[PDB]
């Protein structure tokens, strides 16, 4: 929020797990101890659309994200044109 | 254009990409390397070739110009590179910045992941009534 | 997979959880894979990544259709035999009203079995055997009982050719991956050698054995089981044993003849099923072509040839991959096979090819709507499977820069036009009717669009109809009447029970349905066209060939990002076509009875099943339930306690099943989940559920159980609505 | 005849409420969507995967509810009238042996007792009622035209508007000419509404015109 | 080389974006202010939407002896 | 000279669309449209206003005088004006409150000529509100007016027609 859909999990390891999703997710930001030690839920999200391709793969064990952002640009929906 | 003709990524026609809203606002464009003359797939439906120059195709919107990867890395190459063009300059240096390949470590940048309290028992609904004096603007 | 092989088991795989994509059906239990397994059971992205087999399966699992169509037909010939009515109906046509099926009087049953003709209890027919069957240069009940087992023969054998493929160690590539000859053969001698062969058993035997049937007798007071050999002596009544000719050519003399044929056109007074004296000639004159024609050829060459400026450079090379596709060379076909079925649907009703049709009303409209739903149900398909091409079939991209790569080049374009086409239509193609209501309910006819108010004046006539029934005066030789009696000029006298065909007039109330068709046929196709075209990539999703041509919907973002895909363009494209056909049907019978079907008596004062109510009153789209739906259907809602009754008694179910589709069509998904657990809970308390994780419907399965229902619902509704307003008056 | 409708108004507020009770009894969340909140109500849709997730906002069950409140409040009203109708300028035996079944509920009532209205635009001039029957077909359209919204789902609509907004921009005598609002296809909750708020008037404007257009001659 | 015709008049060529017609007929400032009031447009339109549209509808609906609906 | 211009998708780069075929950019057509607001803004929008108002003017007659609500009129106030001197009016401010999507407030007067224009970045806007007034002001006196030498013209008519 402005893009706020929680995909977080607990491993945040990203090998044979999850990568897919247009730009949005430049992570691998190792928090001082979480197994394959790369963590959190996002980077700077003011860039791309609203997928849930976000999970589909690699756990969120709870919810998984979708549209919830409301405040919604245009570069945030393909169509500002 | 022509009097300045600086091309690289061969095509011919198409009713696909770039139209009015890429001048009047933002621009978005991808660049790359390659070995020897090879025929590609394309966003916007079409299909052409390569060889070199800058290898610098311009693209409507940035979800469009990374898909050169979602197939254009099932066709060899470390190097592919898209930036952000305006109608005047910068701020938003798109694939520029620091390191590259979303899955390494130099810095941490943004992200966070938590809100106030974590995924735990938010059976707790919406709290205070939104009022200008208690840390809920994040 | 083992089990274990390669090479080194005969021991077959019966037992060990799964198969079909590789973290497969997993050990861990679930339900979804039980609609999986049946759905996509036939598919090819799995079985193997290597063509080879697949064509070796489809040439077998094919087979078991012919064999089936073959077990079918048999129970129809048998059925159309000992469960008789055919013997009885034929000495006695114009009179009977045929049957083949009968119940057995268990429970309520029997009402369904109501006196049908040659003196017996049964349920009627709108499936014109009893009329192909006119043929029988022979007649006899037990005989059809040979043609019947002759059917089961072709089957078991034309079903052990299917063992004698895939399961037997199979052919390979070259065999089909040399295409070089295929049509050469097919069209030449079967397309040819049938039509040809059919000629020889279409004057030999049939013509004579209805040349002197169209009068009286009772069979076996005619046509023995052998009688028609060397005995070219009864062939004497129906032309010479060539007298002095020798194998056509010309040094021939006619002071008074010209072999059988002697071309007709019109309709037998006593059996207006179109003349047979022709029916040989036309099939003969076919075959020749095919006989000559299937003699091309070996393949590129011809297509690797004509290009131009804007034309198709890739025309040249229009697919190596047309020996390497299927999903392509099936989709093409369905458009034709399909579009070449509903062209039947006309040449039938405006030119009957069997003895006793038209007079038989109900036993050739059933037809013209059954044949009508295939020349439609096979077309949306003919798009689906192109989408299945457009997405995947080939290995890589070896296909390049051509006719297609061309069409796609424009694509936000071919479909940019076509769109406006539709809203131009629709406005000129439906609100057109709505005018009438809004202004006939306002009520000022001066200004409607009536066949009489908006300027058109007591004539339609001058177009091309009137230069068709009048054309036997061109290069045309001739032969009394036309080609199709329903044409403008001349003639009347057609039939002595009821009626058949006559002119069929037009103008408006024929003008504008004919146009709603346009707009209906067009916006159908928009959605399929744009659907198959944008199959793999787009500026809503470009990362959009990444699974398959289905996929539910990409995801809540981009605004919507739901329907997209092309399973679904072939889901909302059915949804229309159900109309496309469903309103074309609505057209024919309201015409064909409002005018045409009706009846002669003295001074042949014609009396249509409805004195042309159409006139000023289909133009109002309420008249379409004033004059249609509420008028006719009074026979469906009166139908209780009768003999047909099974229609009114369907007409509630299936007029229910449709109104059950919306539930499957209109609803969420984690919904029936959220629900399915409340359930699953109550289940666990007694200790009664978990094993085989019960799950809701697979987003797109849900759509699969829309649509399919919405159709078998919304359709049989009329299948009932119909058979109930041609049986009994009409 | 009354020992059935009376058990079919009962199958309404029960089903209608298993969905509203449910709809309600977790706008909070559940197994498929555990943390379904901070916004609860109308978040319509979620990404594919998990099992496949959809109209699983407490709104879209409300959304889903309103169909059976439009099916109870139909069986119930339907019932009075047929009864009343018959119980007036005529019999009552009518509802008696001819409401104990189903076909007949369609035939005599539904099919009997419309008569008056529809041959009211009649090929033979505007007679007594004309507002009503035109309403009644306005009734059948507003309804049907729900369905789009309802079997269409923003994805297909947006995309050809992507092609259909390559027009203007690429066509003369209609260039420069700027919109101030960017051509898009309806929100992924919005159309579940509008098909409905559409399904409804059609439906509720049809009986409106139906009963009146037949309790007015009558007979009864 | 005869059909090497040195491009029978080059043209120059590309006429131009240059100049294949003069311009607009001299009829103009024969309307200078003629019909102003949208050529005094300096705050208006509210005026022409009570005025014009109360006289496309005031007398437009009323009538002295029906010729009815 | 070539196969079709020096063979090109667009003016130049093939990553904009337009797919310049014919029906797009044949000197056969592109000239039948540039004394007017196609490629270049001649004089201001001032005058183009009435050739636009007027031409579009004496249209909308037979459309609502020969397809009129109760048609083929025997009223001396039809076969012309009648009402339709309403469409031009219902749309001669269907426009003005679109020129509120244009403001940009100036007064240069450059309908006289200087140095072979371009208006350069002439695309996008670069026609302010005090322009779109003098056009949709030319529209009213082009609409209303252009409706009367329709009406005023007697009607010597060709007809039938089959
Ligand atoms: C008596 C014999 C027999 C046996 C034991 C087998 C055994 C086998 N066949 Mg097989 N096959 C047979 C006869 C037999 N076949 C015949 C006669 C044909 C041609 C008609 C084929 C064509 C065939 C193909 C193309 C394939 C196999 C394959 C296989 C293997 C998988 C079988 C399976 O589970 O399919 C289960 C299906 C059935 C048991 C039913 C078969 C369907 C047809 C013939 C009849 C059913 C239609 C029926 C009217 C249902 C619709 C109506 C419904 C409403 C009732 C297995 C070793 C497959 C293989 O090699 O592995 C990938 C391969 O796909 N077969
Ligand atoms: C010549 C053609 C023919 C052939 C050989 C095929 C072959 C194929 N099609 Mg296909 N198709 C066709 C015509 C054909 N199609 C047409 C005309 C259409 C348009 C409607 C389609 C639309 C279509 C779609 C959308 C899909 C396919 C797919 C496929 C593939 C999957 C087959 C499968 O698993 O069975 C599927 C059959 C079943 C699961 C049986 C269920 C049938 C139900 C719906 C019953 C129908 C109602 C009926 C009245 C009920 C029986 C009576 C009952 C009341 C008692 C296969 C290669 C699928 C694919 O993914 O490609 C790889 C994809 O799903 N087809
Ligand atoms: C479950 C629900 C409830 C019930 C009981 C019904 C019932 C009905 N709705 Mg309905 N509806 C509902 C909720 C319900 N609806 C809701 C919530 C909505 C949305 C608001 C609708 C919207 C709706 C519409 C738009 C329509 C209906 C219609 C109908 C009726 C069809 C006529 C009929 O079935 O005659 C009863 C007689 C029979 C069923 C005889 C059956 C005998 C045959 C089929 C053979 C025996 C069965 C055998 C197994 C079948 C052979 C299959 C074999 C191969 C196995 C039926 C009474 C339709 C209607 O007719 O008028 C409105 C109309 O289309 N409904
Ligand atoms: C009765 C129906 C309703 C209506 C009016 C429409 C209309 C349309 N559908 Mg559609 N559709 C519907 C139900 C409806 N649908 C349903 C229920 C489904 C699925 C269940 C679909 C699935 C579907 C698909 C997949 C597609 C369409 C498309 C279309 C458009 C086709 C082009 C056209 O002719 O439109 C214009 C004409 C009309 C809408 C009919 C005339 C309307 C009359 C009443 C005139 C009114 C105008 C007047 C000025 C009113 C102003 C007065 C003032 C008081 C407001 C059209 C907008 C397609 C498309 O967009 O292609 C262009 C696309 O293919 N539909
Ligand atoms: C006209 C229809 C028809 C025909 C000719 C076939 C033919 C075939 N189906 Mg099939 N199928 C059909 C309708 C049909 N199906 C329908 C409606 C469904 C429901 C979705 C299926 C679901 C299905 C599955 C899951 C499988 C097949 C398979 C097969 C093939 C296996 C043959 C075999 O193994 O032994 C033949 C066995 C016998 C003759 C034994 C007698 C059995 C009874 C039914 C008679 C064969 C090509 C198997 C396959 O993949 O091959 C391509 C596979 O197992 N089918
Ligand atoms: C295309 C058709 C197919 C269909 C739908 C039917 C349908 C029917 N057949 Mg049948 N039949 C068929 C093919 C078919 N048959 C074939 C190929 C044969 C030759 C083996 C037969 C030989 C046959 C006999 C001998 C009988 C039937 C009977 C029947 C009826 C009894 C119902 C039943 O089978 O189970 C229960 C039913 C209407 C029965 C009948 O007509 O009595 C009412 C009679 O028992 N059939
Ligand atoms: C391909 C076709 C079909 C078949 C299998 C036959 C077969 C036969 N025809 Mg024949 N015929 C046919 C089409 C066919 N005809 C057609 C379309 C016509 C009309 C154009 C005829 C006109 C015809 C005549 C006049 C006679 C035959 C005779 C015969 C028999 C022996 C002579 C012969 O034609 O071939 C074998 C070739 C030689 C013996 C040499 C043989 C049973 C004759 C007969 O009765 O038996 C001798 C003779 O009467 N046919
Ligand atoms: C019958 C009646 C009614 C009348 C009296 C007119 C009269 C006229 N129309 Mg017209 N029109 C009508 C109904 C009518 N229209 C309708 C219903 C439409 C439907 C759109 C039109 C569409 C229309 C167009 C598009 C045009 C006219 C034009 C004209 C005028 C030019 C005459 C001409 O041919 O150029 C004489 C040309 C030379 C001598 C050179 C003329 C004053 C215009 C016109 O005709 O210019 C060519 C313009 O073309 N009309
Ligand atoms: C239905 C609306 C009428 C508009 C079309 C009318 C124009 C043509 C006139 C009638 C058309 C029907 O054609 C019909 O004419 C006569 C009816 O009087 C009938 O006349 C028939 O009956 C008699 C018996 O020998 C003789 O007068 C005729 O030789 C014979 O053809 C015919 O069965 C049919 O040819
Ligand atoms: C109603 C509905 C459901 C719920 C429908 C369900 C759960 C149907 C599945 C029921 C199955 C077929 C019952 C099977 C049980 C029996 C086969 C087991 C006993 C065996 C027999 C002897 C009875 C969805 O899952 C769904 C999904 C996506 C979009 C719309 C909808 C939708 O509208
Ligand atoms: C047609 C259609 C569209 C396309 C959007 C369209 C067609 C909007 C078209 C605007 C119409 C023409 C406006 C006419 C409505 C008037 C009554 C004016 C409304 C006034 C309001 C302020 C009340 C969707 O975006 C959509 C999204 C999700 C599910 C289904 C669909 C769907 O069926
Ligand atoms: S893979 Fe999914 S941490 Fe793991 S669930 Fe979070 S992004 Fe990586
Ligand atoms: S899930 Fe959201 S953030 Fe992640 S890629 Fe998709 S849109 Fe971007």
Name chain A's partners: 3 or more CB pairs within 8 A.
B, C, D
Report the SS3 class of residue C662: helix
Query: Taking Cα atoms as reference points, which of D123, D3, D132, D146 lies closest to residue D66?
Result: D146
Query: Taking Cα atoms as reference points, which of B103, B105, B70 lies closest to residue A15?
Result: B103
Give the tokens for residue D188: 């992924």
Return d(Cα C537, Cα B43) in angstroms, integer: 7
Domain B1-138 -> CATH class: alpha beta
Contact list, F86 vs chain E (CB under 8 Å): 56
Give residues 19 to 48 of B whose Cβ lies within 8 Å of F: 19, 23-24
Nearest chain A CA: its distance from B82 CA (Å): 11
Interface touch B1/F9, C-beta < 8 Å = no
Which of ligand 5's atoms lies nearest the C-alpha of C39?
20
Q: What is the DSSP letter of C602?
A: G
Query: Taking Cα atoms as reference points, which of C531, C552, C536, C545 lies closest to residue C704?
Result: C552
The answer to whether C634 and C628 have CB atoms below 8 angstroms apart is no
> What distances in angstroms separate CA D10 from CA C730, D14, D65, one per listed residue?
44, 7, 15
Interface touch A48/B62, C-beta < 8 Å = yes
Interface touch C559/D185, C-beta < 8 Å = yes
Give the Å distance between the CA of D133 and the centre of ligand 4: 22
Strand (E) or helix (H) holding B81 = strand B80-83
Give the tokens for residue D80: 């009075």
Neighbouring residues of A50: CB distance < 8 A, sequence distance ≥ 6: A3, A5, A66, A67, A69, A76, A77, C555, C556, C557, C558, C561
Contact list, D154 vs chain C (CB under 8 Å): 559-563
Which of ligand 3's atoms lies nearest the C-alpha of C655?
31
Give the Å distance between the CA of C282 and the centre of ligand 8: 53
Percent helix, percent strand, percent coil in chain C, to nearest 5:
35, 0, 65
Strand (E) or helix (H) holding C78 = strand C78-79
**Atom 32 in ligand 10: residue holding the nearest Cα:** C664
- Judged by a CB distance cut-off of 8 A, whether residue B57 touches chain F is yes
Return d(Cα A28, Cα B100) in angstroms, integer: 11
Alpha helices, DSSP H only, in chain F? 45-57, 87-91, 129-143, 148-151
Euclidean distance between the first and the last CA atom of chain A, given in angstroms as a whole number: 24
The answer to whether C494 and C500 have CB atoms below 8 angstroms apart is yes
Give the tokens for residue F20: 């310049």
Give the Å distance between the CA of A50 and the centre of ligand 8: 54
The packing angle between helices C708-722 and C658-665, to 10°, is: 170
Give the CATH number, domain containing residue E58.
1.20.5.220
**Atom 7 in ligand 5: residue holding the nearest Cα:** C61
Phi, psi of D30 (to 5 degrees): 180, 135
β-bridge mates for residue F6, sequence order: F4
Q: What is the DSSP letter of C446?
A: T
Please indicate if the annotation marks A21 as binding a ligand: yes
Interface touch D126/C651, C-beta < 8 Å = no
Mutational pocket test of ligand 9: of C489, C492, C611, the residue with most ligand atoms within 8 Å of the beta carbon:
C492
CA atoms within 13 A on the CB side of C336: 5
Give the tokens for residue C158: 């034309």
Contact list, F123 vs chain B (CB under 8 Å): 23
| Interface E:D, ≥3 CB–CB pairs < 8 Å | no
The answer to whether A1 and A69 have CB atoms below 8 angstroms apart is yes
Q: What is the DSSP letter of B29?
A: E
> What distances in angstroms separate CA C210 from CA B70, C203, C281, one per listed residue?
70, 10, 17
| Region of residue A11 (phi > 0: left; psi between -120 and 50: alpha; otherwise: beta) | alpha
- Residue carrying structure tokens 């849900």: C702
Phi, psi of B56 (to 5 degrees): -140, 80
> Is D148 near ligand 11, meaning CB less than 6 Å away?
yes
Strand (E) or helix (H) holding B58 = strand B56-58
Residue B43: closest CA among chain C residues belongs to which residue?
C542
- Residue carrying structure tokens 């008596």: C601
Neighbouring residues of C306: CB distance < 8 A, sequence distance ≥ 6: C315
Query: Taking Cα atoms as reference points, which of D128, D93, D125 lies closest to residue D212?
Result: D128
Give the Å distance between the CA of C652 and the centre of ligand 3: 6
Strand (E) or helix (H) holding B56 = strand B56-58
| Pairs of residues, one from chain A and one from chain B, whose beta carbons lie less than 8 Å apart | 67
Return d(Cα F87, Cα F57) in angstroms, integer: 10
Give the closest ligand to the alpha carbon of residue C9: 1
> What distances in angstroms separate CA C559 from CA A75, B20, C713, D43, D189, one per listed residue?
11, 21, 33, 13, 10
Return d(Cα C466, Cα C451) in angstroms, integer: 19
The answer to whether C65 and C92 have CB atoms below 8 angstroms apart is no
Written in H, E and C, the secondary structure of chain D is CHHHHHHHCCCHHHHHHHHHHHHHHCCCCECCECCCCCCCCCCCCCCCCCCCCCCCCCHHHHHHHCCCCCCHHHHHHHHCCCCCCCCCCCCCHHHHHCCCCCCCCCCECCCECCHHHHCCCCCCCCCCCCHHHHHHHHHHHHHHCCCHHHHCCCHHHHHHHHHHCCCHHHCCCCCCCCCCCCCCCCCCCHHHHHCCCCHHHHHHHHHHHHHHCCCCCCCC
**Atom 64 in ligand 1: residue holding the nearest Cα:** C57
Indicate the domain borders of chain B. Answer: 1-138
β-bridge mates for residue C101, sequence order: C123
Pocket of ligand 12 (CB under 6 A): A 7, 9, 11-14, 17-18, 58-60
The answer to whether D121 and D130 have CB atoms below 8 angstroms apart is yes
Indicate the domain borders of chain C. Answer: 1-730
Give the tokens for residue C502: 């006559």
> What distances in angstroms separate CA A41 from CA A70, C693, D39, one per listed residue?
19, 30, 20
Interface touch B119/A75, C-beta < 8 Å = no
Strand (E) or helix (H) holding C292 = strand C292-293
Strand (E) or helix (H) holding B82 = strand B80-83
Strand (E) or helix (H) holding B30 = strand B29-32
DSSP notation for C517-580: HHHHHHHHHHHHHHHHHTSS--SS-SS--SS-S--S-S-S-SS--SS-SSTTTTTHHHHHHHHH
**Atom 35 in ligand 3: residue holding the nearest Cα:** C652
> Is C17 near ligand 9, meaning CB less than 6 Å away?
no
Full domain range(s) for residue E53: 40-62
- Judged by a CB distance cut-off of 8 A, whether residue A67 touches chain B is no
**Atom 43 in ligand 2: residue holding the nearest Cα:** C708
- Judged by a CB distance cut-off of 8 A, whether residue F101 touches chain D is yes
Give the Å distance between the CA of C67 and the centre of ligand 2: 19
> What distances in angstroms separate CA C453 from CA C444, C446, C449, C457, C516, one per listed residue?
10, 6, 6, 9, 21
Percent helix, percent strand, percent coil in chain A, to nearest 5:
0, 0, 100
Give the tokens for residue C554: 């990409």
* Cis geometry, peptide bond prior to residue A2 (ω within 30 degrees of 0): yes
The answer to whether D27 and C669 have CB atoms below 8 angstroms apart is no
β-bridge mates for residue B58, sequence order: B29
A1-81 folds as Alpha-Beta Plaits (3.30.70)
Query: Taking Cα atoms as reference points, which of C273, C244, C246, C241 lies closest to residue C260?
Result: C241
Return d(Cα F119, Cα F125) in angstroms, integer: 11
Return d(Cα C590, Cα C621) in angstroms, integer: 13
> Is C702 near ligand 10, meaning CB less than 6 Å away?
yes
| CATH, domain C1-730, list 1.10.3720.10, 1.20.1130.10, 3.30.300.30, 3.40.50.300 | 1.20.1130.10
Give the Å distance between the CA of C659 and the centre of ligand 3: 6
Going by the annotation, the residues of the binding site of D for phylloquinone are 157
Residue ranges of domains in chain F, CATH in brackets: 1-162 (1.20.1240.10)
The packing angle between helices C572-594 and C708-722, to 10°, is: 10
């Amino acid at each position: 929020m402005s893009h706020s859909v929680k995909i977080y999990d607990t491993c945040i390891g990203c090998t044979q797990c999850v990568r897919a999703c247009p730009t949005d997710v430049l992570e691998m930001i190792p928090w001082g101890g979480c197994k394959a030690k790369q963590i959190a839920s996002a980077p700077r999200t003011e860039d791309c659309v609203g997928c849930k391709r976000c999970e589909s793969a690699c756990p969120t064990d709870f919810l998984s994200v979708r549209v919830y952002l409301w405040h919604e640009t245009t570069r945030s929906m393909g169509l500002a044109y | 254009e022509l009097d300045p003709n600086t091309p690289s990524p061969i095509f011919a026609g198409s009713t696909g990409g770039l139209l009015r809203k890429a001048q009047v606002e933002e621009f978005y464009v991808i660049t790359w390397e390659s070995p020897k003359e090879q025929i590609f797939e394309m966003p916007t439906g079409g299909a052409a070739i390569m060889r070199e120059g800058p290898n610098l195709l311009k693209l409507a919107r940035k979800e469009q110009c990374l898909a050169l990867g979602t197939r254009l890395r099932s066709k060899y190459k470390i190097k592919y590179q898209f930036y952000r063009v305006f109608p005047s300059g910068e701020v938003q240096y798109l694939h520029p910045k620091d390191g590259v390949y979303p899955e390494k470590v130099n810095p941490g940048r943004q992200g966070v992941g938590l809100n106030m309290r974590s995924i735990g028992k938010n059976v707790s609904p919406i709290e205070v009534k939104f009022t200008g004096k208690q840390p809920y603007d994040l | 997979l083992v089990d274990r092989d390669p090479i080194k088991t005969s021991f077959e795989q019966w037992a060990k959880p799964g198969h079909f994509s590789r973290t497969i059906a997993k050990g861990p239990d679930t339900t979804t894979w039980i609609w999986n397994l049946h759905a996509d059971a036939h598919d090819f992205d799995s079985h193997t990544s290597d063509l080879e087999e697949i064509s070796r399966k489809v040439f077998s699992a094919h087979f078991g259709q012919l064999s089936i169509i073959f077990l079918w037909l048999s129970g129809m010939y048998f059925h159309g035999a000992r469960f008789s009515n055919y013997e009885a109906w034929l000495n006695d046509p114009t009179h009977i009203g045929p049957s083949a099926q009968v119940v057995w009087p268990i429970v309520g049953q029997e009402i369904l079995n109501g006196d049908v003709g040659g003196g017996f209890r049964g349920i009627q027919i709108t499936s014109g055997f009893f009329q192909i069957w006119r043929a029988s240069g022979i007649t006899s009940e037990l005989q059809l009982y040979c043609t019947a087992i002759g059917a089961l023969v072709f089957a078991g054998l034309m079903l052990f050719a299917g063992w004698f493929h895939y399961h037997k160690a199979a052919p390979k590539l070259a065999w089909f991956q040399d295409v070089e000859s295929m049509l050469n053969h097919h069209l030449a001698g079967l397309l040819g050698l049938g039509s040809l062969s059919w000629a020889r058993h279409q004057v030999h035997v049939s013509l004579p054995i209805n040349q002197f049937l169209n009068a009286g007798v009772d069979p076996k007071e005619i046509p023995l089981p052998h009688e028609f050999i060397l005995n070219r002596d009864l062939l004497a009544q129906l032309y010479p044993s060539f007298a002095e000719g020798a194998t056509p050519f010309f040094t021939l003399n006619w002071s008074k003849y010209a072999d059988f044929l002697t071309f007709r056109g019109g309709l037998d007074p006593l059996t207006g099923g179109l003349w047979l004296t022709d029916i040989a000639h036309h099939h003969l004159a076919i075959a020749i072509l095919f006989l000559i024609a299937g003699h091309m050829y070996r393949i590129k060459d011809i297509l690797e040839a004509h290009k131009g400026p804007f034309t198709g450079q890739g025309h040249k090379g229009l697919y190596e991959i047309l020996t390497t596709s299927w999903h392509a060379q099936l989709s093409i076909n369905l458009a034709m096979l399909g579009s070449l079925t509903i062209v039947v649907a006309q040449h039938m009703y405006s030119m009957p090819p069997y003895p006793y049709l038209a007079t038989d009303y109900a036993t050739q409209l059933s037809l013209f709507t059954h044949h009508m739903w295939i020349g439609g149900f096979l077309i949306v398909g003919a798009a689906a499977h192109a989408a299945i091409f457009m997405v995947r079939d080939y290995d890589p991209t070896t296909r390049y820069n051509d006719l297609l790569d061309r069409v796609l080049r424009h694509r936000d374009a071919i479909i940019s036009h076509l769109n406006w086409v539709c809203i131009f239509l629709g406005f000129h193609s439906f609100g057109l009717y709505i005018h009438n209501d809004t202004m006939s309910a306002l009520g000022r006819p001066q200004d409607m669009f009536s066949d009489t108010a908006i300027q058109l004046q007591p004539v339609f006539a001058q177009w091309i109809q009137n230069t068709h029934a009048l054309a036997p005066g061109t290069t045309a030789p001739g032969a009394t009447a036309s080609t199709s009696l329903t044409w403008g000029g001349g003639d009347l006298v057609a039939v002595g029970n009821k009626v058949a065909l006559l002119p069929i007039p037009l103008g408006t109330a024929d003008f504008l349905v004919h146009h709603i068709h346009a707009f209906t046929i067009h916006v159908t196709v928009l959605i399929l066209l744009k659907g198959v075209l944008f199959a793999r990539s787009s500026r809503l999703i470009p990362d959009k060939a990444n699974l398959g041509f289905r996929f539910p919907c990409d995801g809540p973002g981009r605004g919507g990002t739901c329907q997209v895909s092309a399973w679904d363009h072939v889901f909302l494209g059915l949804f229309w076509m159900y109309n496309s056909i469903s309103v074309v049907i609505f057209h024919f019978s309201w015409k064909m009875q409002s005018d045409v079907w009706g009846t002669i008596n003295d001074q042949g004062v014609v009396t249509h099943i409805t004195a042309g109510n159409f006139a000023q009153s289909s133009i109002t789209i309420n008249g379409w339930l004033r004059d249609f739906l509420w008028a006719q259907a009074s026979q469906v809602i009166q139908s209780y306690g009768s003999s047909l009754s099974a229609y009114g008694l369907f007409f509630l179910g299936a007029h229910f099943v449709w109104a059950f589709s919306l539930m499957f069509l209109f609803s969420g998904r984690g919904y029936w989940q959220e629900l399915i657990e409340s359930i699953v809970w109550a289940h666990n308390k007694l200790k009664v559920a978990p094993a085989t994780q019960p799950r809701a419907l697979s987003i797109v399965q849900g759509r699969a159980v829309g649509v399919t229902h919405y159709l078998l619902g919304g359709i049989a509704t009329t299948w009932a609505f119909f058979l109930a307003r041609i049986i009994a008056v009409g | 005849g009354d020992f059935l409708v009376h058990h079919a108004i009962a199958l309404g507020l029960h089903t209608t409420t298993l969905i509203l009770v449910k709809g309600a009894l977790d706008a909070r969340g559940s197994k498929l969507m555990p943390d379904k909140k901070d916004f609860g109500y109308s978040f319509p849709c979620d990404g594919p995967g998990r099992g496949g997730t959809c109209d699983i906002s407490a709104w879209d069950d409300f959304y889903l509810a309103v169909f059976w409140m439009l099916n109870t409040i139909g069986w119930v009203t339907f019932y009075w009238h047929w009864k009343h109708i018959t119980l007036w300028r005529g019999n009552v035996s009518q509802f008696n042996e001819s409401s104990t079944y189903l076909m007949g509920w369609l035939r005599d009532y539904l099919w009997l007792n419309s008569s008056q209205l529809i041959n009211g635009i009649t090929p033979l001039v505007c007679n007594s009622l004309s507002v009503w029957a035109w309403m009644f077909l306005f009734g059948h359209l507003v309804w049907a035209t729900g369905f789009m919204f309802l079997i269409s789902w923003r994805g297909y609509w947006q995309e050809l508007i992507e092609t259909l907004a390559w027009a203007h921009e690429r066509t003369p005598l209609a260039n420069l000419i700027r919109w101030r609002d960017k051509p898009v296809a309806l929100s992924i909750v919005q159309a579940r509404l509008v098909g409905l708020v559409h399904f409804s008037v059609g439906y509720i404007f049809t009986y409106a015109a139906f009963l009146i257009a037949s309790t007015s001659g009558k007979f009864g | 080389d005869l059909e090497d015709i040195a491009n029978t008049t080059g043209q120059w060529d590309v006429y131009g974006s240059d100049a294949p017609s003069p311009y607009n007929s001299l009829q103009s400032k024969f309307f200078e202010t003629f019909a102003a009031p949208f050529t005094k447009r300096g705050l208006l339109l509210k005026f022409l939407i009570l005025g014009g549209g109360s006289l496309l509808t005031y007398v437009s609906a009323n009538a002295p002896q029906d010729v009815l609906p | 000279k070539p196969t079709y211009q020096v063979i090109q998708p667009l003016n130049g780069d093939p990553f904009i669309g337009g797919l310049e075929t014919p029906v797009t950019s044949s000197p056969l057509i592109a000239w039948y449209l540039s004394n007017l607001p196609a490629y270049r803004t001649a004089v201001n929008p001032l005058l183009r206003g009435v050739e636009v108002g007027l031409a579009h003017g004496f249209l909308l007659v037979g459309p609502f005088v020969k397809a009129g609500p109760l048609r083929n009129t025997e009223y001396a106030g039809a076969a012309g004006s009648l009402a339709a001197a309403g469409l031009v009016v219902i749309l001669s401010m269907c426009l003005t409150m679109y020129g509120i999507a244009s403001f940009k407030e100036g007064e240069p007067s450059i309908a006289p000529a200087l140095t072979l224009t371009g208006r350069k970045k002439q695309p996008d806007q670069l026609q302010s509100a005090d322009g779109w007034a003098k056009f949709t002001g030319g529209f009213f006196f082009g609409g209303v007016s252009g409706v009367t030498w329709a009406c005023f013209l007697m009607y010597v008519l060709d007809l039938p027609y089959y």
